[PDB]
Amino acid sequence: SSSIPMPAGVNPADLAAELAAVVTESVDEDYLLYECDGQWVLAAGVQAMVELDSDELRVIRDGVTRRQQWSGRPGAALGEAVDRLLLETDQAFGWVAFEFGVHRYGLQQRLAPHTPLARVFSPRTRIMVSEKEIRLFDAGIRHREAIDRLLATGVREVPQSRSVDVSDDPSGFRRRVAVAVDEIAAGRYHKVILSRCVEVPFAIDFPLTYRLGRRHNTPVRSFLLQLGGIRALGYSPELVTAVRADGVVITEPLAGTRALGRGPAIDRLARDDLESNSKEIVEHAISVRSSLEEITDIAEPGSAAVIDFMTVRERGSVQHLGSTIRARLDPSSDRMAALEALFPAVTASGIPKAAGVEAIFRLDECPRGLYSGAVVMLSADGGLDAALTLRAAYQVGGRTWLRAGAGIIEESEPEREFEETCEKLSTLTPYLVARQ
Numbered sequence: 001s002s003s004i005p006m007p008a009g010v011n012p013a014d015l016a017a018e019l020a021a022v023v024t025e026s027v028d029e030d031y032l033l034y035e036c037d038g039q040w041v042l043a044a045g046v047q048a049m050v051e052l053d054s055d056e057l058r059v060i061r062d063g064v065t066r067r068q069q070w071s072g073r074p075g076a077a078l079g080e081a082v083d084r085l086l087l088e089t090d091q092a093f094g095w096v097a098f099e100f101g102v103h104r105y106g107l108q109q110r111l112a113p114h115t116p117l118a119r120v121f122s123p124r125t126r127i128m129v130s131e132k133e134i135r136l137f138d139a140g141i142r143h144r145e146a147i148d149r150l151l152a153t154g155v156r157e158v159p160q161s162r163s164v165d166v167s168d169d170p171s172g173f174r175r176r177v178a179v180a181v182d183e184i185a186a187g188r189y190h191k192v193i194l195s196r197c198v199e200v201p202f203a204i205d206f207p208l209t210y211r212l213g214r215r216h217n218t219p220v221r222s223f224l225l226q227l228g229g230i231r232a233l234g235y236s237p238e239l240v241t242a243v244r245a246d247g248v249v250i251t252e253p254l255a256g257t258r259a260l261g262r263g264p265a266i267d268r269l270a271r272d273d274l275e276s277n278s279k280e281i282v283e284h285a286i287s288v289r290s291s292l293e294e295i296t297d298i299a300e301p302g303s304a305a306v307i308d309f310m311t312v313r314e315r316g317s318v319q320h321l322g323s324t325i326r327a328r329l330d331p332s333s334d335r336m337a338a339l340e341a342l343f344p345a346v347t348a349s350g351i352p353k354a355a356g357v358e359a360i361f362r363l364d365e366c367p368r369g370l371y372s373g374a375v376v377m378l379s380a381d382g383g384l385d386a387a388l389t390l391r392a393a394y395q396v397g398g399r400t401w402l403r404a405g406a407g408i409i410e411e412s413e414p415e416r417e418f419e420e421t422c423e424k425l426s427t428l429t430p431y432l433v434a435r436q
């Protein structure tokens, strides 16, 4: 509801991130930038905030915090609070923790009090950036003036990045991998994704880092946020769930990994290896089966289908085997129920789910929080778009970190699994812009 023609030699990702940096800073506000199918949506300012925790639900608007106790499904509690936000505004944005998906698998009591499950907000203003134009939704005079100043200033040149060491293992990932391998060999579960955090020993400039890393990655979705004391950015390699206004539900499971970006002929050899490797084919097949079973739980009988099976999905520093699972949302179900059914992603949890999710509580640094959760965009028309939170950097308090994991199966070796985490961390490590 008002538009500005997109400038000549300006990329949408660069202008969207610059608007997020410069405009929100001049007004000192929180925001969330979400990239979805050629559109960069900047959700600027917080009109109301839904905070879902393990023990309480809070809705915060114009200084007033309303508290509620909730029981049963976290999805039903969040759904009720978000539908309310959406009666007022067209779109809501936020993040859903890994911990949101534990209730389905009987692990609710394992959550410590005040464990975040989700943060979803109604923005005061939305600025939508595409190749076509810049659209303004409910932008006030002060914001419009700040936008015009940004367009006249132009985009900042991105400085040289600063390197980070990913070779150290302070959290004993190699040790934790060996424990999971022993458990799988004993028949406890088939696969588990374990992870490790990597401390970034300097403050980074989130918008500039986002810009730099975006030039070198091909994610399904991307985000940049500053929300409630959390800064985060990511190049999501997978849609965990999308629910369209017409009832169509999609999930894009990934399983299997090879390095990418190492040179054309090297990348082709790795691509050919991935597509013919029995170990990778088996795991992908098993994951697509698990994913189909989950989507079946919320779909119209017999509406579930695999529309893309076992194809190479290129993701910057890595390439994965991917499938697309499509269904029709059953009338007895809803968008939150679909999210819960597909949560946490099989890709970043384990198989069987209940045993794999429980192994993560024992064998990984918990709560995972944003990592392996999702970044979400919800619409008043019933839409839900949820990007899997992998290939992301975070800043909370005075701490900046990266996080990456690997799929552990019976044949897994701690050394090769550690190397696999290095490949995934390389989606970001060469593009970290130091804060100036």
Ligand SMILES: C=C(Oc1cccc(C(=O)O)c1O)C(=O)O
Pocket (backbone or CB within 6 Å): 193, 195, 237, 254, 255, 256, 257, 320, 347, 348, 390, 391, 403, 404, 405, 406, 407, 408, 424
């Ligand atoms: C979990 C991470 O990445 C992954 C993505 C897709 C598949 C796998 C897998 O192991 O089959 C995988 O490990 C991470 O980037 O932290």
